[PDB]
Design a protein around this ligand. Structure first.
Ligand SMILES: Cc1cccc(Oc2nccc(-c3c(-c4ccc(F)cc4)ncn3C3CCNCC3)n2)c1C
Length: 127
């Protein structure tokens, strides 16, 4: 079972913006999760070949990872904060769907998600 192409990070005809909320999602949210000791499995698309998970992309039909989110934010790919928040939530949900409670990867996702939620709680009002 092969790896699919990664999610889109560039699309010139897609409408996109910089908003103060999206700037916060890069400078605070992404930066905080990316530096965490448990970030590494989430910093790029899941390599189902190298990890020997031939079922991964048969089960996970909306893949997402922080490498992709990082490129999207750096490329100003998003229209709004909700689109980016959805990508994070998709990432965590995929992990919980594929794995089982108490697995190392789930504990790692849970730690990152706790911080994500703490930072989103302080999302600035749009300017
Ligand atoms: C605990 C462990 C053991 C073996 C390899 C690992 O590294 C790793 N790297 C990328 C993805 C995953 C991963 C995800 C994963 C990671 C990020 C994501 F966004 C979605 C799924 N879901 C399950 N795994 C592994 C597959 C092999 N058996 C252990 C669990 N794990 C990890 C950490």
């Amino acid at each position: 079972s092969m790896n699919p192409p990664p999610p889109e990070t560039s699309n010139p005809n897609k409408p996109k913006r910089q908003t103060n909320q999206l700037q916060y999602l890069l400078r605070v949210v992404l930066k905080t999760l990316w530096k965490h000791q448990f970030a590494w499995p989430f910093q790029q698309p899941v390599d189902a070949v190298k990890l020997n998970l031939p079922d991964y992309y048969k089960i996970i039909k909306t893949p997402m990872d922080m490498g992709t989110i990082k490129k999207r934010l750096e490329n100003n790919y998003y229209w709004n904060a909700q689109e980016c928040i959805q990508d994070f939530n998709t990432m965590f949900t995929n992990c919980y769907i594929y794995n089982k409670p108490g697995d190392d990867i789930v504990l790692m996702a849970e730690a990152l998600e706790k911080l994500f939620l703490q930072k989103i709680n302080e999302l600035p009002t749009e300017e």
